[PDB]
């Protein structure tokens, strides 16, 4: 992806958004407990840790567009992904307005927490104004849609997160880019039945994790991902990805069925506007990012660019062989035999895609579930139900976390929530954390799961 334009909203008309940004984090009551050393992600330009231009740390993650037109790996690899999907049998019928507002099955209602973005959160304007789950009225939602149009632009603000002390100091935090409600429920008008399938079916037809639960899919990847395994870590794959990869997803697109309509979507998350504060911008390239509605789709681009990727740097490599998973950026593959990782990320950088084996430096100690991560998580078979996988947090994460809150009040449920990614790790490890709540008189006197009740509910999912 790459910026075309930057033009303040004066320029065009674009309707700002606020202050203060100040970050809602705050050491909690375990902050000088555990050990960690994240910190608040720098929110605004004067903030006093900065060691660089903020502005220009945020939009450099845009590195620019290499290929803005499938080359033949691409369009192979496109064609593969997408006769591999035709046997879910997608509906590709347009989904009605009621249950991309308010959900199926298999699908979300679109979250009232989150802001409704451009023009609505500029202002004032709430989801919880326009939607009703009691109701499920859309009479609202298409006097809004009328109101507004369609292909508004990206409502993009900093995320209020923990990060590293070199991300703070190099003012590299992370932005949302929010589309705007109009467009989200267009979009899931549009490719809500493919939402409901891939939600539904996990694993290596689809190609995608996105909505699995770690608990229970961890158990069965073993099982969807046979041989050798092989797994990157990108960095910053949102913003490397050139049009080239959104044509590529319109190719497979049209190959399943779907209406010129319905494809001619992909453009507008190709090619968007952006308002940060008070400027706007044009990016080319680029999955908008911090949402959960363009999962799906960096998901199947994934599968694309591994296919392409392969099929590019070896020679009679056969993609009906490899198996794999994506969710977002994150990728887990399985190939008969073991892939030159180092080769891969070579090809990955002609494509203007950054690469890193996941580990130390280089490459691949084959890559074997010992040491696999995914979602952030290993993979820990139970000592007593080898068949059993547990996915693995690491405490060092979770460590972190718990050293920090937004909310004084829910110290409670922060740290349920943190002995329900714990315990995972082994009895050992979970007792040790534990004890160590425990060393302080607030942590005495918090509700905290025993392990062996935690793991009896667990076997229960199988
Ligand atoms: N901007 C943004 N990215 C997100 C968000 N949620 C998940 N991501 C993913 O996080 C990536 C950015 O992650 P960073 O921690 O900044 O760095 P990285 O891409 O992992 O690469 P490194 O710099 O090598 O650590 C994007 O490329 C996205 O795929 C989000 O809310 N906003
Ligand atoms: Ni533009």
């Excluded at 502005?55 to 691409?74: C, H, M, R, W």
């Excluded at 009691?134 to 009479?139: A, F, G, K, P």
């Excluded at 399943?256 to 400027?279: D, F, P, W």
């Excluded at 998901?299 to 694309?304: A, C, R, T």
Aim: net charge negative.
């Amino acid at each position: 992806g790459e910026i075309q334009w930057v033009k303040p909203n004066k320029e065009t008309g674009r309707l700002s958004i606020n202050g203060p940004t100040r970050t809602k984090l705050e050491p909690s009551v375990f902050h000088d407990v555990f050990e960690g050393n994240k910190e608040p992600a720098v929110l605004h330009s004067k903030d006093p840790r900065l060691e660089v231009d903020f502005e220009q740390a945020l939009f450099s993650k845009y590195v620019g567009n290499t290929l803005y037109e499938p080359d033949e790996y691409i369009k192979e690899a496109a064609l593969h992904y997408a006769n591999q999907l035709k046997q879910l049998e997608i509906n590709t019928s347009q989904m009605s307005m009621e249950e991309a507002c308010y959900g199926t099955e298999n699908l979300e209602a679109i979250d009232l927490h989150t802001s409704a973005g451009y023009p609505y959160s500029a202002l004032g304007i709430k989801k919880r104004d326009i939607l009703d789950p009691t109701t499920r009225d859309v009479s609202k939602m298409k006097f809004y849609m009328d109101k507004y149009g369609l292909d508004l632009p990206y409502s993009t603000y900093v995320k209020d997160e923990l990060r590293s002390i070199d991300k703070i100091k190099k003012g590299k935090s992370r932005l949302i880019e929010a589309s705007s409600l109009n467009d989200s429920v267009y979009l899931r008008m549009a490719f809500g039945h493919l939402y409901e399938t891939f939600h539904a079916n996990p694993g290596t037809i689809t190609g995608s994790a996105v909505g699995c639960n770690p608990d229970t899919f961890w158990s069965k990847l073993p099982i969807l991902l046979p041989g050798s395994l092989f797994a990157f870590d990108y960095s910053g794959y949102d913003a490397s990805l050139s049009p080239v990869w959104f044509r590529a997803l319109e190719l497979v697109l049209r190959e399943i069925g779907y209406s010129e309509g319905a494809i001619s979507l992909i453009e507008g998350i190709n090619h968007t506007h952006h308002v940060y504060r008070n400027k706007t911008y044009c990016v080319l390239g680029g999955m908008p990012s911090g949402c959960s509605g363009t999962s799906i789709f960096n998901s199947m681009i994934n599968n694309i660019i591994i296919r392409a990727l392969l099929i590019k740097t070896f020679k009679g490599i056969d993609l009906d062989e490899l198996n794999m998973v994506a969710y977002g950026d994150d990728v887990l593959a399985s190939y008969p035999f073991p892939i030159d990782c180092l080769e891969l990320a070579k090809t990955g950088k002609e494509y203007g895609l950054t690469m890193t084996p996941a580990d130390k430096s280089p490459c691949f100690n084959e890559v074997n579930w010992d040491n696999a991560t995914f979602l952030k998580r290993g993979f820990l078979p139970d000592e007593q139900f080898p068949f059993l996988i547990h996915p693995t947090m690491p405490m060092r994460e979770i460590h972190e976390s718990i050293r920090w809150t937004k909310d004084a009040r829910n110290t409670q449920d922060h740290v349920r929530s943190l002995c329900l990614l714990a315990w995972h790790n082994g009895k050992q490890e979970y007792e040790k954390f534990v004890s160590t709540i425990r060393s302080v008189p607030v942590g005495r006197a918090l509700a905290i799961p025993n392990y062996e009740n935690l793991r009896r509910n667990w076997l229960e999912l199988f």
